[PDB]
């Protein structure tokens, strides 16, 4: 069984507590959340097609109490429809509570809650940057492998009313038609190069005229003329993405044709940045909601 109300309740019960109180669910409950949510991810299309109104968040990176502050201001599900753009674990202390509360809502409201895959929702990355460590200390190694099998079926991109294109990373030189995105057959591992790798790793750059090499050593960088031609060929108007920490929680690119979202404020304590989320009304009009520390 999955007493999900008891799970979501025991997670939200620490709301307002002193910072630093963990939520240790049972190994078989967390194991059940992965299987029941993986069941959902594979049933839904790999290229999600969503309808507004919808609230879009960026990266979380294990800042669970900061994920809760996002929900009180944005409305706890099912108040507003939600779509996340990956990067839920790592670089933060509470990665397990973060992904569990996100996996919990995805099961409770499977048509009003949505999660995309990020480059940190991959085995070879979260092993190093602190998520697998969080599994080792509080649970066992096999649970982290259960988490990997769940991430290996997350959707990659989401198209909101054929005018907003959402993904964690950015554009891909090998991306010519949406059928290439649907042609990807889950479960999948994120490769080191190619179409699937680029959608989770590429960055925008104002200095590149075309496709340039990325500093991360993975994927490429695209310029303002790449975004404009892409929106033009697929009758799109906006590219929403994350994958890059921004000072104001939001950062525009290519004359507002693209925007970078980062939802984790005070990211891992080495920046003083703020976290923002993008709200979308019925008329595809967008408003930014920002969390700023003082």
């Amino acid at each position: 069984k999955l007493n999900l109300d008891s799970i979501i309740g025991r997670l939200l019960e620490v709301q307002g507590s002193r910072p630093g109180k963990n939520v240790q669910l049972t190994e078989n409950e967390i194991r059940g959340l992965c299987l029941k949510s993986r069941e959902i991810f594979l049933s839904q299309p790999i290229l999600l097609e969503l309808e507004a109104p919808l609230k879009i968040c960026g990266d979380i990176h294990g800042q669970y109490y900061d994920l809760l502050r996002l929900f009180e201001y944005g409305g706890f599900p099912p108040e507003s429809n939600y779509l996340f753009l990956g990067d839920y674990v790592d670089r933060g202390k509470q990665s397990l509570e973060t992904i569990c509360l996100l996996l919990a809502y995805k099961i409770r409201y499977p048509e009003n809650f949505f999660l995309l895959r990020g480059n940190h929702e991959c085995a070879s990355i979260n092993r190093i940057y602190g998520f697998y460590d969080e599994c080792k200390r509080r649970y066992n190694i096999k649970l982290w492998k259960t988490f990997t099998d769940c991430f290996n079926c997350l959707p990659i991109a989401a198209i909101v009313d054929e005018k907003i294109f959402c993904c964690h990373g950015g554009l891909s030189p090998d991306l010519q038609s949406m059928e290439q995105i649907r042609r990807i057959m889950r479960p999948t591992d994120v490769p080191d190069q190619g179409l699937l790798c680029d959608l989770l790793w590429s960055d925008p750059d104002k200095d590149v005229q075309g496709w340039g090499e990325n500093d991360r050593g993975v994927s490429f960088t695209f310029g303002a003329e790449v975004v404009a031609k892409f929106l033009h060929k697929h009758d799109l108007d906006l590219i929403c993405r994350a994958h890059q920490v921004v000072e104001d929680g939001y950062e525009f690119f290519a004359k507002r044709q693209l925007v970078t979202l980062f939802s984790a404020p005070n990211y891992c304590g080495e920046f003083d940045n703020a976290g923002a989320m993008m709200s979308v009304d019925e008329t595809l009009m967008c408003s930014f909601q920002i969390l700023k520390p003082a």
């Binding site: 502050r69 201001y73 009313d161 054929e162 005018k163 907003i164 108007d237 906006l238 507002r256 008329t283 595809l284 009009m285 967008c286 408003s287 930014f288 909601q289 920002i290 969390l291 700023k292 520390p293 003082a294």
Partner: peptide
């Protein structure tokens, strides 16, 4: 079909600020 718009284009404030500690 509906096209994307922004709050600053229609006069609405684009940014809504919330603070914590």
């Amino acid at each position: 079909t509906r096209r994307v718009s922004f709050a600053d284009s229609f006069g609405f404030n684009l940014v809504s600020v919330k603070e914590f500690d």
